Design a protein around this nucleic acid. Structure first.
Ligand SMILES: Nc1ncnc2c1ncn2[C@@H]1O[C@H](COP(=O)(O)OP(=O)(O)O)[C@@H](O)[C@H]1O
Ligand code: BEF
Ligand SMILES: [Mg+2]
Lengths: 178, 1623
DNA sequence: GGCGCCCGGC
DNA sequence: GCCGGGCGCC
């Protein structure tokens, strides 16, 4: 049922073996920015699988901006290769997906107050703080941001199948509301 | 500013490459025409080498290059580092690595530039590491332009600066220095370090020493620099790449012997025979390799001479290709390419070993992500182009077959599918280079295997460039195989005919139900960890459907190509494989088969060969299409699910009797081998249309009323899903029919009833969302029109041409619909202009895209004779315009219900869409249409004007020589016309769209455009003002670099003279110092000072071009004489002209001078002093006298008028035409609504001119009322000025504003400042007056009195709390209470007697307390300022001893008459009868004030003069005084400062002391420095951890800017570009 | 909220 | 030659 949602952003996490002398990464590589008094990590960027990679001093890495699982893996491998090129003893030891963010445009607008007031146990509405309704599923553990304009963006999925499941489970619900 | 400063500024900020190129070219010309300006230019351009932006830095480097190339070379005969000493080991072991250096150390930046250079020069020797230990910055404590200048090389200072800047910690500055040295050395190196007097022999030694010293530093940077960019697949090291270029630059001139020292050092850096065995190898080796690249590139002449150098460079290359690091391998592969044809001559052994190693570097696979293989394969492709290399392959084969060429080439196949796109593209290009060789070399490997590999690389590749290169490679391979024998090609591709045909015709599917390709069909490159597997699975969701369609059409192209060459008896397998697909149950298979047949017919030599397919193709368009497609089974299954849900809703909540309703079939039509009983959309229609109402009949009462409000929504869900399924099926039918019709058109069949062909093709053009299919269909119809016209079957041809013309006009966003806008009149349409809105907009965009491509291909196909071969298009785009605009508009053209208006609009749209592609032989037709379009531009209806404006924008955009002459001759001169608004509106719309479309091509014509645009920023119509200001803001920017543009080639002679007539005007307007001198004709009775003469030149300039401005000269510079002389000269000139010509516009008329009341006498006195021959009438006095003067005003040269008299007697002052109308003290009209301003703005006048001391108090936004008086609407009406400028600026002042609001405010205020600046004339006093002695502004402090303390504490303890809590409120009344309290407080501060009137809160207690003191309220002990004033009067000798030199004469200022009377009574009479004083305040009539000022000024008997600031404060010259005492102060600092400055001015001859009497406490503290020295000149989540709604995106708050474009590296470091710049 | 001053009056 | 006033502004 319904029309499938797209993906917009996949966040993936990698643990590098070695401690990083993080300032030297900013000093040596142009595609990198480091401001410890604002944020604690060096935000590398790479062009071909267009992504940004937060590289923390502990060796953790968070890669963002890819739109496919294999694309995110490839980008993270390239970032590990870059950190190995700067001279650190960096290894692609681990890789986990942590959030796949889906998005879709449903044609009809949403009677948002109906969803806010009929469903109780998993719905919350905050009109001025954030214009969308916050829907918190239980079985797939996906949070859906539902907007009056019919925009729905899904987050917290570990794999795309959960995104599709959540959308086809919420579609026959909000179909009852305009 | 001047022209030069703005032209240099263009380099930083510019639209495009073209504008910056023009700026640098014009800088070069400006240097050529004025050679001595060389260093004045370089000192302006050099500081941009340090700029933060790459493009600005590169453009500044180019500007230096071009400027230097025009400077003369240096040859006077017409501590340096030694290169031999460079010990590479120490420089890398010790020394400072150069990186993106740390934060700025401001203590060093503060140094004077020369001492800064000296200190950095001291630190340089340490940082290079020559000390034998790592230098630490602590050892060196930190604590006419540097680039400025025949005894020595002129650029010696600049190079001394740049050579030390070359080691700066910042990476930007190192880049800048490297490029600056690159250009300066490239042009002038041969003269470097020469000096005068020394012999040529000795100057050669000095030049050698200097260039060795430079190359030393360049090598040091090559080995020390480690900064790199890892954004792309191959790391780029921008600084050492630039330094490689600079080393190439010095290498051109450096002596032949020193090239060997450079070569030895680079060779040492590459081999690293003695350096530590560490990771340090990488940077040093890469630097050495780029150095060797430029050594071999720029000095070919050295390699041929002796073998050791060529042997060592090839040793370095061979070592590098075997290196572990991929970047070393890449740069080594790149190093040999420039020298291949030089190297092939070398000894056989070196060539054999190089071929061996370059081939063996492909034998092993590299790292998965290593992109370096691309460069190695480029090296291999270049090597294999030379016959000596191929002969070496033959020699190798003769002793080892395994290294033969035909058996080595398969080593490239595993890299076709490489993970890095650059590697795939490099492989395909290398294989293409191998194919184009002698057939004997390549006939061994061109076989079925490589054909299959390339074909499967045509299907699975997503990247566009790899796709196109693979298809070109396939074309060359298959064509070259065919050229040997078609039977050979057939034999090779026989075994792969069927698998690749299956892969070519495979279906596509839908997002979550893909149809995967069989992996067994894909053959491995080796003959049998990121895998490009998404495309093989047909995963439509991960790879967009457009990509899959593109792969299918490209596979169809390749298969159609190869089918052409095989002889037709052998095509049987291909024929059956495609004929079985034309009837395939999948829509996509039928489409792909149709495209395969299309391409085969297309690139086959003759359609008669392909004719056998004709009946299978024609049956597709003739016969009824199948009702289902297996590709679409998802839609019908969704229909089934929804209909079942509706039935369930009936069963559960309708509670209908079960079993009297249809059980829907489980299997859906289109499923594999589903029987005829399967569910179908026809059954869904039967359900929702008939069965639904049948169940409504069946449902009982009591259930209907509750069941229906759900059943209705369920029915609408089901019916919309059914319509969606039907729409998808219809779309597939249209697509397949269009593909079939295109295939038929390719076979040149023309049925006797072509309506099915035409309908299918048009339906595809009108509907196809996918761009590729739509373009294919457009090319089809474009060919079909030609087929019909050549056959003579004109009927269908004209029908399709008319239909295409109709489609081209459908985008309402571009072509207006006439019936809606037909009534609109005098609206500038360019400003004003459900989901069905967006859906219809999208469909209109699709259909217009299709029809526009169809008409473009029609134009390109028919060429010069299109208008002859296709008459109906001529009719379309010529008949409506000649009907409508040959004469006046026929009245039917206005009727919305008559199509003729839409015919006119469509004609203009057709001209707009055709003329940018129309063949140049048809431009005389468009120019023949221009006279009608320019008449439609003057039309009354808004929509015709809008369309005509866009049409002339495009016509002039593509016919510049002929269109622009018509526009300038017959549109622009009408723009001044006041009689008819349509003319001006049309012209301004043309200029708007013309500026929009032409971009930078307008540069020759901006002088024609600018002056008639500037003239219209003050137009009466509001929309004209909006567009005129918008155009001017983006058109003045191009003026500074106009003057050097060569004349437009075809432009008429008269227009060039017109250009030259006003190029001078705009050049004077932007930079007033260029203004021509104006010889004042009349005999002014006093000689003007220098700056006065220049200001009069400015005023005469404004008078000559009918601009109006503000003579904002600082107080006391003598604005009166400037104004009087310009007014007198204008009267003289216009009287002369009226006698000469009788023109009414120059007839004699009186001028008006409006001033505050007290200056009415002053102006008459100044006139009688300087211009006695002008009659002046003082329209001032009681109303009876003004009534007596009522009619006399016309008969005098100048009328003087007070502001209040102007307000009250506006009813008579307004009735006369006033010529000049000078507002003396114009800042009193700052209020936009105050009555005197509402009065003054009503006066008619030819020229207007404000005089002020200070134009603003706090903010530039106060200027609005003045410019609304001078030039009505120049800054817009009040709301437009407020929301455009004022509200953004005000909002941006607070910390509340976001950074976007802050930068918007800065941009807005800069826009206003640039808009208003040319009209203000501001020159400060101290800049131009040197005889005038200085002034000093002291304070004088007196303690508060007892009563003042008592009343302050009382006011604060009783009412202070309420006021301070009211400060927490923001309404008018609250801040009114604050203002009242402050104003009340000040009156108390001056003296208690002012406030302590009867009935005051403190009155009775004050009386009894005064009784306790035993003195009256008026005792001056309770008023301290009176007690202070006596001190300053006495110590200045005023009133002392009641020689008589009298060293001081004073003014004393008060804000109010009570304070002045108190001072005049107590201090001046009760205490000091010895003082003699004069009165000046409101008690004396305005006619007496001039006399009393004259009495004080001429007669030294009187000691002091008493002034009310409101009365005496402004302009009234009182030069005789030499000290001023401010006993009471205004809030506004400008009135306070002006009260001082009316004492200190021209003619004053003593040092002036200004005393402010200040009480120690209270509000006096808040007014101390104001007047002293201020002149007023969506998807959003937290990435690190999932949460809804972040308020702050911490790690990305900067926005990271944006990722820089790789074109910066690609176009800048190109070696072929570098060598091009030698000469 | 004030106080100024171009007015009409004696 | 003086006066007090209503309109105007900060
Ligand atoms: N050519 C001049 N020669 C001598 N004095 C001049 C000349 N021009 C102006 N002044 C003198 O400067 C003063 C004129 O300043 P002014 O025009 O009244 O400025 P503002 O009107 O702004 O107060 C007078 O003293 C005048 O004698
Ligand atoms: F004429 Be100025 F403003 F003193
Ligand atoms: Mg003045």
């Amino acid at each position: 049922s319904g029309i499938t949602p797209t993906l917009q952003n996949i966040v993936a996490t990698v643990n590098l073996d070695c401690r990083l002398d993080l300032k030297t990464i900013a000093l040596h590589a142009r595609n990198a920015e480091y401001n410890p008094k604002r944020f604690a990590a060096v935000i590398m960027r790479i062009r071909e699988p267009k992504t940004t990679a937060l590289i923390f001093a502990s060796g953790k890495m968070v890669v963002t901006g890819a739109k496919s699982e294999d694309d995110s893996k490839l980008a993270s491998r390239k970032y590990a290769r870059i950190i190995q090129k700067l001279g650190f003893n960096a290894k692609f030891t681990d890789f986990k997906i942590q959030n796949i963010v889906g998005s879709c445009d449903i044609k009809f607008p949403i009677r948002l107050e109906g969803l806010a007031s009929k469903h109780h146990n998993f719905s919350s509405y905050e009109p001025e703080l954030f214009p969308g309704l916050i829907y918190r599923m239980i079985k797939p553990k996906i949070v859906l941001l539902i907007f009056v304009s019919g925009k729905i963006v899904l987050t917290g999925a570990k794999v795309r199948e959960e995104i599709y499941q959540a959308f086809e489970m919420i579609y026959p619900v909000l179909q009852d509301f305009r | 500013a001047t022209r030069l400063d703005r032209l240099v500024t263009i380099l930083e900020t510019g639209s495009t490459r073209l504008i910056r190129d023009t700026a640098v070219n014009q800088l070069a010309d400006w240097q050529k025409q004025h050679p001595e300006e060389l260093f004045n230019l370089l000192s302006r351009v050099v500081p941009y080498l340090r700029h933060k932006d790459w493009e600005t830095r590169t453009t500044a480097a180019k500007a230096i290059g071009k400027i230097i190339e025009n400077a003369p070379l240096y040859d006077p005969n017409a501590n340096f580092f030694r290169l031999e000493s460079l010990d590479v080991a120490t420089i890398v072991k010790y020394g400072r690595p150069l990186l993106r250096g740390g934060p700025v150390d401001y203590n060093l930046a503060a140094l004077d530039p020369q001492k800064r250079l000296a200190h950095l020069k001291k630190t340089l020797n340490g940082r290079l590491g020559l000390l034998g230990r790592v230098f630490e910055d602590e050892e060196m404590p930190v604590e006419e332009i540097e680039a400025d200048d025949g005894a020595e090389w002129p650029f010696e200072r600049l190079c001394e600066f740049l050579k030390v800047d070359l080691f700066d910690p910042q990476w930007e500055t190192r880049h800048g220095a490297a490029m600056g040295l690159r250009e300066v050395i490239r042009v002038h190196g041969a003269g470097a370090g020469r000096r005068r007097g020394k012999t040529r022999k000795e100057n050669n030694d000095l030049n050698r020493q200097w260039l060795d010293d430079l190359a030393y530093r360049l090598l040091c940077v090559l080995m020390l620099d480690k900064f790199t960019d890892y954004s792309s697949d191959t790391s780029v090291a921008p600084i050492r790449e630039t330094v490689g270029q600079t080393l190439g630059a010095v290498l051109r001139h450096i002596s032949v012997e020193s090239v060997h020292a450079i070569y030895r050092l680079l060779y040492c850096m590459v081999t690293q025979e003695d350096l530590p065995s560490e990771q340090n190898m990488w940077a040093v080796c890469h630097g050495g390799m780029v150095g060797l690249r430029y050594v071999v590139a720029v000095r070919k002449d050295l390699l041929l001479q002796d073998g050791d150098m060529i042997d060592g460079v090839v040793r370095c290359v061979m070592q590098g290709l075997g290196d572990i690091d991929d970047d070393v391998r890449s740069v080594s592969a790149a190093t040999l390419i420039p020298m291949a044809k030089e190297f092939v001559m070398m000894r056989r052994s070196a060539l054999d070993s190089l071929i061996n190693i370059v081939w063996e570097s492909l034998s092993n696979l590299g790292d998965d992500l290593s992109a370096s293989t691309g460069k190695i394969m480029d090296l291999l492709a270049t090597l294999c182009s030379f016959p000596e290399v191929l002969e070496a392959m033959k020699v190798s084969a003769s002793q080892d077959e395994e290294r033969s060429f035909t058996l080595l080439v398969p080593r490239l196949y595993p890299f076709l599918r490489h993970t890095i796109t650059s590697v795939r593209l490099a492989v395909l290009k290398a294989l293409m280079t191998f194919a184009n060789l002698g057939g004997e070399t390549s006939q061994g490997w061109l076989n079925g295997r490589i054909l299959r590999l390339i074909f499967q690389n045509i299907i699975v590749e997503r990247d566009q460039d790899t796709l196109n290169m693979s298809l070109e490679l396939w074309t060359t391979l298959v064509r070259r195989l065919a050229a040997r024998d078609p039977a050979i090609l057939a034999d090779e591709f026989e075994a792969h005919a069927e698998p690749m045909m299956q892969l070519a015709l495979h279906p596509i599917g839908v997002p979550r139900h893909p149809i995967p390709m069989n992996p067994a069909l894909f053959q491995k490159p080796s003959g049998g960890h990121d895998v490009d597997g998404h495309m093989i699975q047909g995963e439509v969701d991960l790879v967009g459907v457009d990509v899959l369609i593109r792969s299918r059409i490209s596979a169809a192209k390749a298969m159609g190509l190869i089918m052409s060459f095989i002889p037709t008896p052998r095509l049987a397998s291909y024929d059956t494989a495609v004929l079985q697909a034309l009837s395939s149950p999948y829509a996509s298979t039928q489409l792909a088969a149709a495209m395969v047949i299309d391409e085969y017919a297309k690139n086959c030599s003759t359609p008669e060969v392909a004719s056998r397919f004709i009946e299978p193709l024609q049956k597709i368009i003739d016969l009824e299409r199948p009702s289902h497609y297996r590709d679409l089974v998802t839609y019908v299954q969704r229909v089934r699910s929804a209909s079942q849900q509706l039935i369930n809703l009936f069963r559960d909540h309708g509670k209908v009797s079960q079993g009297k309703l249809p059980t829907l079939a489980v299997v859906v039509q289109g499923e594999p081998e589903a029987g005829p009983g399967a569910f179908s959309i026809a059954n869904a229609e039967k359900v929702v249309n008939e069965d639904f109402e049948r169940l409504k009949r069946l449902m009982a009462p009591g259930q209907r009323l509750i069941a229906l409000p759900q059943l209705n929504e369920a029915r609408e869900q089901t019916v919309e899903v059914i319509e969606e399924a039907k729409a998808a099926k219809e779309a597939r039918d249209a697509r397949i029919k269009a593909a079939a019709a295109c295939a038929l058109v390719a076979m040149k069949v023309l049925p006797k009833k072509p309506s099915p062909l035409i309908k299918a093709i048009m339906d595809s053009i009108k509907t196809e969302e996918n761009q590729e299919l739509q373009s294919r269909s457009a090319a089809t119809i474009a060919r079909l029109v030609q087929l019909f016209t050549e056959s003579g079957r004109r009927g269908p041809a004209e029908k399709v041409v008319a239909n295409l013309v109709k489609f081209s006009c459908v985008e309402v966003a571009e072509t207006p619909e006439f019936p809606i806008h037909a009534h609109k009149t005098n609206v500038i349409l360019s400003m004003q202009k459900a989901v069905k809105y967006a859906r219809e907009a999208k469909a209109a965009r699709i259909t217009r895209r299709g029809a526009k491509e169809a008409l473009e291909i029609l134009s390109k196909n028919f060429g010069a004779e299109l208008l002859e071969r296709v008459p109906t298009l001529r009719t379309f785009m010529e008949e409506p315009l000649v009907r409508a605009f040959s004469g006046d508009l026929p009245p039917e053209a206005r009727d919305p219900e008559n199509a003729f208006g839409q015919e006119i609009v469509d004609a203009m749209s057709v001209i707009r869409t055709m003329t940018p592609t129309l063949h140049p032989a048809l431009h005389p037709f468009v120019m023949q249409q221009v006279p009608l379009v320019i008449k439609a531009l003057r039309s009354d209806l808004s929509v015709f004007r809008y369309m005509a404006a866009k049409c002339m924008a495009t016509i002039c955009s593509v016919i510049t020589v002929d269109g622009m002459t018509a526009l300038v001759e017959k549109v622009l001169p009408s723009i001044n016309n006041p009689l008819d608004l349509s003319f001006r509106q049309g012209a301004i719309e043309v200029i708007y769209h013309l500026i929009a479309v032409m971009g930078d091509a307008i540069l020759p014509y901006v002088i024609f455009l600018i002056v008639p645009v500037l003239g219209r920023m003050s137009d009466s119509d509001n929309q004209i003002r909006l567009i005129a200001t918008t155009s001017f803001a983006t058109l003045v920017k191009l003026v500074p670099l106009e003057a050097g543009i060569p004349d437009p080639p075809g432009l008429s002679e008269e227009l060039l003279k017109g250009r030259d007539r006003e190029r001078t005007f705009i050049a004077q307007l932007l930079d007033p110092k260029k203004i021509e001198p104006f010889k004042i004709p009349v005999a002014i009775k006093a000689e003007l000072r220098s700056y006065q003469q220049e200001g009069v030149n400015w005023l005469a300039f404004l008078n000559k071009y009918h601009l109006h401005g503000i003579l904002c000269d600082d107080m006391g510079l003598g604005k009166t004489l400037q104004t009087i002389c310009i007014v007198a000269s204008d009267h003289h000139q216009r009287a002369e002209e009226f006698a000469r010509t009788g023109a009414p516009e120059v007839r004699k008329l009186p001028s008006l001078i409006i001033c505050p009341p007290t200056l009415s006498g002053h102006w008459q006195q100044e006139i009688k002093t300087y211009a006695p021959f002008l009659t002046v009438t003082a329209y001032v006095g009681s109303p009876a006298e003004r009534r007596a003067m009522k009619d006399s005003l016309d008969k005098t040269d100048i009328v003087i008028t007070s502001y209040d008299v102007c307000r009250n007697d506006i009813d008579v002052i307004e009735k006369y035409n006033w010529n000049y109308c000078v507002l003396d003290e114009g800042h009193l009209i700052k209020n936009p609504k105050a009555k005197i301003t509402l009065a003054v703005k009503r006066l008619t006048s030819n020229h207007r001119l404000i005089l002020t001391g200070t134009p603003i108090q706090n903010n530039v936004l106060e200027l609005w009322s003045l410019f609304d008086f001078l030039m009505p609407g120049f800054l817009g009406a009040e709301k437009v000025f407020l929301d455009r400028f004022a509200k953004p600026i005000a909002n941006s002042r607070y910390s509340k504003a976001s950074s976007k609001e802050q930068e918007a405010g800065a941009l807005a205020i800069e826009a206003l400042h640039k808009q208003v600046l040319p009209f203000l004339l501001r020159r400060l006093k101290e800049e131009v007056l040197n005889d005038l002695p200085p002034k000093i502004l002291q304070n004088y402090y007196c303690d508060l009195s007892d009563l003042q303390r008592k009343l302050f504490e009382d006011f604060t303890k009783r009412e202070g709390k309420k006021i301070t809590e009211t400060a927490g409120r923001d309404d008018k009344e609250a801040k009114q209470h604050i203002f009242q309290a402050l104003q009340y407080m000040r009156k108390l501060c001056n003296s208690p007697a002012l406030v302590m009137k009867p009935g005051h809160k403190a009155y009775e207690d004050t009386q009894k307390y005064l009784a306790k003191h035993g003195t009256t309220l008026e005792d001056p002990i309770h008023a301290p300022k009176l007690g202070a004033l006596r001190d300053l009067l006495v110590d200045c000798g005023i009133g002392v001893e009641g020689t008589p030199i009298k060293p001081h004469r004073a003014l004393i200022f008060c804000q109010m008459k009570e304070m002045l009377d108190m001072v005049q009574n107590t201090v001046l009479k009760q205490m000091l009868p010895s003082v003699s004083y004069l009165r000046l305040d409101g008690s004396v009539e305005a006619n007496k004030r001039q006399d009393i000022v004259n009495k004080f000024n001429s007669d030294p008997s009187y000691d002091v003069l008493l002034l009310t600031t409101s009365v005496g404060g402004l302009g009234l010259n009182l030069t005789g005084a030499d000290t001023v005492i401010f006993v009471e102060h205004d809030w506004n600092p400008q009135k306070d400062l002006q009260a001082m400055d009316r004492a200190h001015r021209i003619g004053q001859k003593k040092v002036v002391n200004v005393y402010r009497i200040i009480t120690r406490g209270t509000l006096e503290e808040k007014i101390l420095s104001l007047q002293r020295f201020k002149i007023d000149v969506d998807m959003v989540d937290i990435e690190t951890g999932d949460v809804r709604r972040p308020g702050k995106k911490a790690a990305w708050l900067e926005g990271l800017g944006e990722l820089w474009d790789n074109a910066q590296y690609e176009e800048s470091f190109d070696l072929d570009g570098f060598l091009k710049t030698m000469q």
